[PDB]
Amino acid sequence: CMRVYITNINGQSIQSTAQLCQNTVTDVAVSLGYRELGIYCYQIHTDSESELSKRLDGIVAGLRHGDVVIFQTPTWNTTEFDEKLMNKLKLYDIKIVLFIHDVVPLMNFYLMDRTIAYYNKADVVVAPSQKMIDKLRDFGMNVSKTVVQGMWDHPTQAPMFPALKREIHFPGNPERFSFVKEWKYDIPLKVYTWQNVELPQNVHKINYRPDEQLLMEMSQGGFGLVWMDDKDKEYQSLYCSYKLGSFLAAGIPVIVQEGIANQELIENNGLGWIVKDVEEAIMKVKNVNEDEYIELVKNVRSFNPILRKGFFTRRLLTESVFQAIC
Amino acid sequence: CMRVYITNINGQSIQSTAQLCQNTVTDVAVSLGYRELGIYCYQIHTDSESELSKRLDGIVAGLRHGDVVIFQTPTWNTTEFDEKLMNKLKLYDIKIVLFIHDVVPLMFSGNFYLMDRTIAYYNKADVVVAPSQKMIDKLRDFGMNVSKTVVQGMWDHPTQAPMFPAGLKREIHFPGNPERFSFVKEWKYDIPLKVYTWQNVELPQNVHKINYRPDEQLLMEMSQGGFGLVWMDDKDKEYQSLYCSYKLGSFLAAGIPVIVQEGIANQELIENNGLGWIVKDVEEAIMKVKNVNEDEYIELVKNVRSFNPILRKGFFTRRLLTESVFQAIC
Amino acid sequence: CMRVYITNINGQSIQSTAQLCQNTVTDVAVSLGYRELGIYCYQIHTDSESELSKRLDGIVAGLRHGDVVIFQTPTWNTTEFDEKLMNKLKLYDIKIVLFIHDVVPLMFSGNFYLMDRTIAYYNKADVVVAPSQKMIDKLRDFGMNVSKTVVQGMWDHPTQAPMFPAGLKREIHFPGNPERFSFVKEWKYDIPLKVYTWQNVELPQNVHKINYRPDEQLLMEMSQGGFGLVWMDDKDKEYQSLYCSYKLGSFLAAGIPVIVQEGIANQELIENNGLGWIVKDVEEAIMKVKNVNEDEYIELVKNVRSFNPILRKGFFTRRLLTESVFQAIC
Amino acid sequence: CMRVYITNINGQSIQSTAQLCQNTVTDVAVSLGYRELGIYCYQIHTDSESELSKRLDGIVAGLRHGDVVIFQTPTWNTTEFDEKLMNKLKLYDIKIVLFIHDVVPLMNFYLMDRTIAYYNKADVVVAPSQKMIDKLRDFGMNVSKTVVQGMWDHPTQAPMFPALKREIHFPGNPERFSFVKEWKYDIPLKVYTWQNVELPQNVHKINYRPDEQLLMEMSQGGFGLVWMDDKDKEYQSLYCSYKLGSFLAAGIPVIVQEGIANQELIENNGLGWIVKDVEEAIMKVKNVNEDEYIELVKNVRSFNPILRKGFFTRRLLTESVFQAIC
Ligand SMILES: O=c1ccn([C@@H]2O[C@H](COP(=O)(O)OP(=O)(O)O)[C@@H](O)[C@H]2O)c(=O)[nH]1
Ligand SMILES: O=c1ccn([C@@H]2O[C@H](COP(=O)(O)OP(=O)(O)O)[C@@H](O)[C@H]2O)c(=O)[nH]1
Ligand SMILES: O=c1ccn([C@@H]2O[C@H](COP(=O)(O)OP(=O)(O)O)[C@@H](O)[C@H]2O)c(=O)[nH]1
Ligand SMILES: O=c1ccn([C@@H]2O[C@H](COP(=O)(O)OP(=O)(O)O)[C@@H](O)[C@H]2O)c(=O)[nH]1
Ligand SMILES: [Cl-]
Ligand SMILES: [Cl-]
């Protein structure tokens, strides 16, 4: 009697997006009848080899031959923890779905070989984009069955207010996104962060809050910006942005940089604009009229029940398990 | 706040496979949080037009703009009912998934005149789930223009029925009705054919007529060994290359290998998963059953029971129910 | 193979609390694997008798002997509709749970003549879920003879709305309609009353009229502090000792303490869980709000937010939906 | 955001009824959206104190303050494991429901004090019967909120055949039930066991099989016997018999010894007979006519959807969590 299990981290800061994504996916999994394998984030060097082995035995205690396990990677307990977890799993007669949230060596490059080595033990890989799959294959990943995630969902019941404020929201940490501290354009940029830092003139810093609260606020109008530093441009063209799903779930259109992964989703669903640089974005906002905006808003709100009800996640969770067996 | 609803027939004989299929899908759908729109099977001519309209209003009472509806077709209340239900649904600001269980104009040649009306209501859907890519291509030839399609691939068979060890019994199981499958009435081979049917008729010498039994009992009995035969009459060969067989799923869920004819829709599922034999004709199937050895049979059985959790947990159905709704929203 | 179904109204104004309640229960029921029987709110006089009969046939199309049905009453299609629905259900070999949301003959004195007809259809159920033990005792006085009863106790309020820190604001929240709650139009106290209503009317000097907002927004706003008032007009004092207040659940789910009148049904829930104050009259409530200190308020808020996961996860409802079905089967 | 967790053992023999009951309860819990804390049955003496501590940390890794945990006891890892698990749980700001499957010291009496000590750390206790609650209170249990289980469910889709064979079924191990090896009555007793033992004349031993298979067989008619040895009579008047639920789920009436816990369920629902001794039972079967049997069968099949759909378990799982908070 096959039971599907999914790993899920615990113990990170409430402000950790990594943990938010894993927990949200697990909430959806549980609603599909899948079972959680909880993982606490701690300092692995404090375990002896036998203590770590038995801690892992505690985590996997409920597993049986014939099950399927979805490994949400990474655990953020370091590569050693991820390798040793995958080793335990491979002791069972089960199929393993590797669900990639991040590829840390592409964000520590030297750890790529060890990472690829444990990736290859999986039966199916779910990756953010076809470009990321292709990239991993160039580094030796040879898992034959793959599934593309496409987009993060954003389950929520936040009310959507009627939507054209010529301003831009950016719910991201300025320490990770340096372009923030360099903002110089006259259109307002609202930075939602827990960071105790002062920023440029037209940047209006706002304190970190509940997601639900953010979404109501944003649904009133304007534009959502998805953007990365020059340092991270290579990774941005591979990953799925969590803030993208958040803008769309709020019910407003987005502005994303050309090259961002899965851009055809934005294009084919008319969810906003794909632009070359911030200058072109600032232009689009200053220049867009009301009827154009109304059109974009309608597209976004026609599309976003997928995000708000968790369907990107339901489909990858179902298709990956299916592929693992068939 | 989107809800997903799915239509589901009721009121047919217990032995009706059409209803078994819809009900099984609906049970899976409900486990996914989808809601049932129950439809009773009755004689539509007994309603005045306003009575039919208000009966349908009763069926769709819980629907709201912004929902998604999965219409399992046909309802078996006749094409007229199917058309009128789709009309009622299209009055709502919803997306519609058309889940094809059968296509009436293709099942029988004399009913081909219904094709235009069928295509016309089909074309009102946003997504079409069809048994096979070939069925999709054939429907497009007759004018279906729905841009989003999903291939079902195989019927599931959700169950927890125990599987007994499968012995190599040189016998063939066929839980189908002899009135629909004329080849059973002509069986002339020296391999026993076990026919499970409610039909009160005597059958050829080498056919063992077994009385209709509940699906769970059938599964348990079949799991004990032998082979499952999926086969159609000469009149039905075209549909065979198009449809998904329900008994195919049943054999596999029971844990025994199957025998099917070359050209059957979705045959690569059988090949790629090592689930049985694809044969040219009945004569070839008889030769394989007579000539298979114990090791080869153990292997087939291993492949089937390695594969069948997908069926017993309803994953062909979970994946189509999830993907079609996704595609419907875009 | 038993399925459990539950009726659920549709078609009322978004601001209709009756529909909010039924829908909220149904969402919980669906999470438990129960199936919806949708009912649309309409003008019953527009159906001929055969049309109404067949509309109902549409609503119950999916039902089978051996199911259990939970009838949330009233449908608000009038007593006549409620009686006819119960008649249709009693044609099936099923068990029926009657889930009382309101009792029309008790809400208004002039409608007391409806009591006999109401009791007569109530008596067709196998189990009755009622807001309070007092309501059960009162109904038995008017002839209800159903042997199995379940006490609801409190409305849940399933939600994930964020709770802001609750500041001690010396202000009282009342998300109710001034047309139904005349006391709001007479407010003369120096503590501000925040009234959330779609009603286009000006209100007394110390009443802050706030426009109707979606429940999630209301919850978030109320969580910021103050007190929630549950109160009825003099004409409604008898019903108060009988019913469950929906806004009571809303205040608690928002994470603020409440103020209620002595004698309100199920008042021990408030007392035993330290959720607010039970007062003699409005004057006493004003005195408490003026005189409460920060520490005492922090304590109340701690008690409320310790208790409210039961509400936000819908456990009063899960327990009545589970226990009533159990009792129905015996 | 409160999440309900439930413990569940793994690693016992497929023939272990203890594990069957825990797994069945957990399957129902999962359908209610509760989450499993898997526990593997192993030899505790092989762990050092720190290894056991971290194994337990692995088991409870997903827990958070504000959750509710249902502890199905015992784990069968020995009392030390149960005590130390309860200790871990008490480090969290959670409510604990203790769901008693067995009380091992009443089945090792000397371990009662330690057992009662860890029981008392729970917020709510679910016990098989009010008599068991009263008994535990006489040994010092002072948990204020209690819930009575009443009966084991028996979720199943086994077909029920039409039901009057004057024979008696007993799906129980003769090593535990010695009265089996002493059977001497002329009415057939069918013993379903994996035990490789030969038995008296009118005892027809049958090999252990899938439950689903057993139930179809039994639904054809006759009577189900629930009975205990003289050694176990005191415990029988406290516990919930699993085989009782099995007979009823099959769709035939039962014969139980006077004094068995929760006997009013049998009486009030007309599910069979409560008798003084085997002699009276043998009499009832020999003497019952068809119309009486038809009546009993109808009662049983009117009642058994509760068992077959898991409602005794759904109600205790829901009511205990409710009581834990209110
Ligand atoms: O005040 C805030 C600001 C941020 N966020 C959440 O944090 C996310 C952004 O985190 P991150 O930058 O790490 O996501 P990324 O787009 O890089 O994947 C947003 O989508 C929000 O959902 C929030 O809940 N409250
Ligand atoms: O004794 C029986 C015989 C048949 N069936 C059911 O009927 C199905 C076959 O029906 P049908 O021939 O109409 O299906 P098809 O394979 O043609 O799609 C089997 O798989 C069983 O599920 C059954 O339950 N009991
Ligand atoms: O702006 C508003 C005002 C009211 N309500 C809802 O209406 C309920 C109160 O309705 P009613 O007075 O009819 O309920 P009662 O307490 O009398 O049962 C509140 O709890 C809210 O759920 C709302 O959603 N938004
Ligand atoms: O061949 C068999 C015999 C036993 N059982 C199961 O084992 C249970 C009896 O186990 P046990 O005696 O330990 O239960 P108890 O009544 O003592 O609680 C029965 O109810 C059956 O469900 C089974 O599945 N197959
Ligand atoms: Cl992190
Ligand atoms: Cl044991």
Ligand 2 atom at minimum distance from B21 CA: 22
Q: End-to-end alpha-carbon separation of chain A, Å? A: 16
Nearest to A36 among D35, D39, D58 (CB): D35
State the sign of the Cα–Cα–Cα–Cα dihedral B55, B56, B59, B64: negative
Question: Domains of chain C: which residue ranges?
Answer: 1-156+314-330, 157-313
3-state secondary structure of D308: helix
Q: A touches which chains (3+ CB pairs under 8 A)?
A: B, C, D
- Tell me which CATH homologous superfamily contains domain A154-309: Glycogen Phosphorylase B; (3.40.50.2000)
Answer whether the bond into residue A74 is a cis peptide, omega within 30°.
yes
CA B27-B7-C158 angle, to 5 degrees, is 65
Q: How many CA atoms lie within 13 A of A296 on its CB side?
A: 26
Burial class (CB in 10 A: 0-12, 13-18, 19+), D201: exposed
Q: How many CA atoms lie within 13 A of A193 on its CB side?
A: 21
For the domain spanning B157-313, the CATH number is: 3.40.50.2000
User: Quick check: B39 and C56 CB within 8 A?
Assistant: no
User: Quick check: B58 and C57 CB within 8 A?
Assistant: yes
Interatomic CA distance for residues B330 and B326, integer angstroms: 6
Chain A positions touching C23 (Cβ under 8 A) are: none
Mark the binding-site residues of C, compressed into ranges: 17, 180, 212-215, 245-250
The closest residue, in CA terms, to atom 23 on ligand 2 is B215
Buried b (16+ CB within 10 A) or exposed e, A274-304: bbeebeebbeebeebeeeebeebbebbbbbb
Q: Which residue of C has its CA nearest to A155?
A: C160
- Looking only at Cα atoms, what is the longest distance across chain C? 65
Chain C positions touching B11 (Cβ under 8 A) are: 61
Q: Do D24 and D153 form a contact (C-beta atoms < 8 A)?
A: yes
- Note every long-range contact of C178-182, with CB atoms under 8 Å and residues 24 or more positions apart, other chains counting: C178/C203, C180/C233, C181/C231, C181/C232, C181/C233, C182/C233
Q: How far is the CA of A16 from the centre of ligand 5 (A)?
A: 6
E strands within C49-206? 68-73, 95-100, 127-130, 148-151, 167-174, 193-197
* Residue D113 host element (H or E): helix D112-119
Resolution of the experimental structure, in angstroms:
1.9
User: Quick check: C319 and D314 CB within 8 A?
Assistant: no
Interatomic CA distance for residues A160 and B1, integer angstroms: 11
Interatomic CA distance for residues C33 and B30, integer angstroms: 7
B208: number of Cβ within 10 Å: 12
Laid out side by side, the sheet with A168-170 consists of A203-206, A189-192, A168-170, A223-226, A254-257, A272-275
Burial class (CB in 10 A: 0-12, 13-18, 19+), A116: middle
DSSP characters for C264-309?
-TTTHHHHHHT-EEEESSHHHHHHHHHH--HHHHHHHHHHHHHHTH
Q: Which residues of A touch B (CB under 8 A)?
A: 1-2, 31-33, 66, 157, 268-269, 302-303, 305-306, 308-309, 311-312, 314-315, 318-319, 321-322, 325-326
Q: Which ligand is nearest to the CA of D20?
A: 4
Q: Which residue has the tokens 């004349």?
A: D201
Q: Which residues of D touch C (CB under 8 A)?
A: 1-2, 31-33, 66, 157, 268-269, 302-303, 305-306, 308-309, 311-312, 314-315, 318-319, 321-322, 325-326
Interatomic CA distance for residues D167 and D160, integer angstroms: 18
Q: End-to-end alpha-carbon separation of chain C, Å? A: 16
Give whole-number Cα distances, B268 to B273, B274, B275, B306, D287, in Å.
8, 10, 10, 17, 62
Beta carbon pairs, A and C, within 8 Å = 21
Chain A positions touching B315 (Cβ under 8 A) are: 318, 321-322, 325
Ligand 1 atom at minimum distance from A194 CA: 1
CA nearest C32: which of C158, C215, C219?
Answer: C158
Interatomic CA distance for residues A32 and B28, integer angstroms: 11
Q: What are φ and ψ of residue A103, in 5° steps?
A: -120, 95
Residue C224 CB contacts under 8 Å (≥ 6 apart), including other chains: C164, C165, C166, C167, C169
Does A154-309 match A1-153+310-326 at the fold level?
Answer: yes
Mutate to test the interface with B, among A315, A316, A317 (most CBs of B within 10 A): A315
Q: Per the structure block, which two tokens stand in for A176?
A: 């990770």
Interatomic CA distance for residues D104 and B293, integer angstroms: 52
Q: Do A44 and A80 form a contact (C-beta atoms < 8 A)?
A: yes
Q: Per the structure block, which two tokens stand in for C223?
A: 């969580």
Q: Which residue has the tokens 């016997």?
A: D225
Buried b (16+ CB within 10 A) or exposed e, B56-73: bbbbbbbbbeebbbbbbb
C316: number of Cβ within 10 Å: 22
Chain centroid to CA B277: 20
CA nearest B57: which of C197, C164, C57, C66?
Answer: C57
3-state secondary structure of B272: helix
State the sign of the Cα–Cα–Cα–Cα dihedral C289, C295, C298, C303: negative
Give whole-number Cα distances, D177 to D74, D173, D193, D232, in Å.
22, 6, 11, 9
Give whole-number Cα distances, C297 to A186, C172, C276, C282, in Å.
46, 14, 9, 19
Q: What are φ and ψ of residue D197, in 5° steps?
A: -130, 145
CA nearest C300: which of C325, C275, C269?
Answer: C275
The DSSP letter of residue D237 is T
CA nearest B16: which of B246, B184, B223?
Answer: B246
Q: Which ligand is nearest to the CA of A260?
A: 1
Give whole-number Cα distances, C148 to B38, B211, B261, C122, in Å.
30, 43, 59, 12
C190: number of Cβ within 10 Å: 9
* 3-class SS shares of chain A: helix, strand, coil, % to 5: 45, 15, 40
* Residue A7 host element (H or E): strand A4-10
Residue C298 CB contacts under 8 Å (≥ 6 apart), including other chains: C168
Chain centroid to CA C88: 26
Residue D159 CB contacts under 8 Å (≥ 6 apart), including other chains: B213, B214, B216, B217, D216, D219
Q: Which residue of C has its CA nearest to B60?
A: C38
Query: What residues pair up with B73 in beta bridges, in sequence order?
Result: B100
* 3-class SS shares of chain C: helix, strand, coil, % to 5: 45, 20, 35
Q: Do A240 and A307 form a contact (C-beta atoms < 8 A)?
A: no
State the sign of the Cα–Cα–Cα–Cα dihedral C127, C130, C132, C137: negative
Q: B touches which chains (3+ CB pairs under 8 A)?
A: A, C, D
State the sign of the Cα–Cα–Cα–Cα dihedral A58, A62, A63, A65: positive
Nearest to D57 among A31, A58, A60 (CB): A58
CA nearest A72: which of A103, A105, A33, A98?
Answer: A98
3-state secondary structure of C174: strand
Return the best residue to mutate from B183, B247, B248, B258 for the ligand 2 pocket (most ligand atoms within 8 A of CB). Answer: B247
> Ligand 6 (ion): which residues have CB within 5 A?
D 16, 18
Q: What are φ and ψ of residue B231, in 5° steps?
A: -155, 150
Q: Do C130 and C144 form a contact (C-beta atoms < 8 A)?
A: no
Chain C positions touching B8 (Cβ under 8 A) are: 62
3-state secondary structure of D124: strand
> Which option is the CATH number for C1-156+314-330: 3.40.50.261, 3.40.50.2000, 3.30.800.10, 3.40.50.720?
3.40.50.2000
Nearest to C58 among B11, B36, B56 (CB): B56
- Note every long-range contact of B74-78, with CB atoms under 8 Å and residues 24 or more positions apart, other chains counting: B74/B101, B74/B102, B74/B104, B75/B7, B75/B9, B75/B39, B75/B41, B76/B9, B76/B12, B76/B18, B76/B41, B77/B39, B77/B41, B77/B42, B77/B44, B78/B44
The count of residues in chain D is 326
Ligand 2 atom at minimum distance from B18 CA: 13
Pairing relation of β-strands C258-261 and D68-73?
Answer: unpaired
Q: C touches which chains (3+ CB pairs under 8 A)?
A: A, B, D
Residue B52 CB contacts under 8 Å (≥ 6 apart), including other chains: B44, B81, B84
Q: Which residues of A touch C (CB under 8 A)?
A: 157-159, 209-210, 212-213, 216
Pairing relation of β-strands C35-40 and C68-73?
Answer: unpaired
The count of residues in chain C is 330
CATH class in words for A1-153+310-326: alpha beta
Chain centroid to CA A36: 19
The reply, when asked if residue A241 is annotated as ligand binding, is yes
Residue D46 CB contacts under 8 Å (≥ 6 apart), including other chains: none
Give whole-number Cα distances, B156 to A34, A59, B76, in Å.
19, 32, 21
Give whole-number Cα distances, C61 to A258, B40, B62, D24, in Å.
53, 5, 13, 33
Angstroms from C308 CA to nearest CA on chain B: 24
Q: Do D269 and D163 form a contact (C-beta atoms < 8 A)?
A: no
Interatomic CA distance for residues C90 and C98, integer angstroms: 12
Q: Per the structure block, which two tokens stand in for B18?
A: 């059409």
